[PDB]
């Protein structure tokens, strides 16, 4: 999925993997998150002219797993 945030003049974008903001995942206004298997939250700190704001965030929600198909029981057929 592709996240999208505000473009701010003078800004530096820091994306983090956790609300603790100790480890980076990316640096972009529109980063891609890949191989998503669980709901995942990214946090964003925008620093403008040296001023770092409160991180914003959003959670990418993973669609439910589709149901297993209904097929017939083991069968047997006679040749021909």
């Amino acid at each position: 999925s592709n996240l999208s945030t505000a473009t701010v003049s003078g800004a530096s974008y820091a994306w983090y993997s956790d609300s603790s903001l100790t480890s980076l995942v990316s640096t972009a206004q529109n980063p891609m998150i890949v191989n998503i298997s669980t709901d995942t939250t990214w946090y964003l700190v925008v620093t403008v002219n040296g001023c770092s704001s409160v991180a914003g965030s959003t959670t990418v929600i993973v669609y439910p797993t589709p149901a297993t198909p209904n097929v017939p029981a083991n069968f047997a057929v006679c040749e021909g």
């Binding site: 980076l24 990316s26 640096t27 890949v34 191989n35």
Partner: peptide, 17 residues
């Protein structure tokens, strides 16, 4: 001025890029 961050675009398959 500062050490840059460098990011990969994911795992690469052997012989790829």
């Amino acid at each position: 001025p500062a050490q840059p961050a460098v990011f990969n675009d994911g795992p690469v398959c052997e012989g790829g890029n």
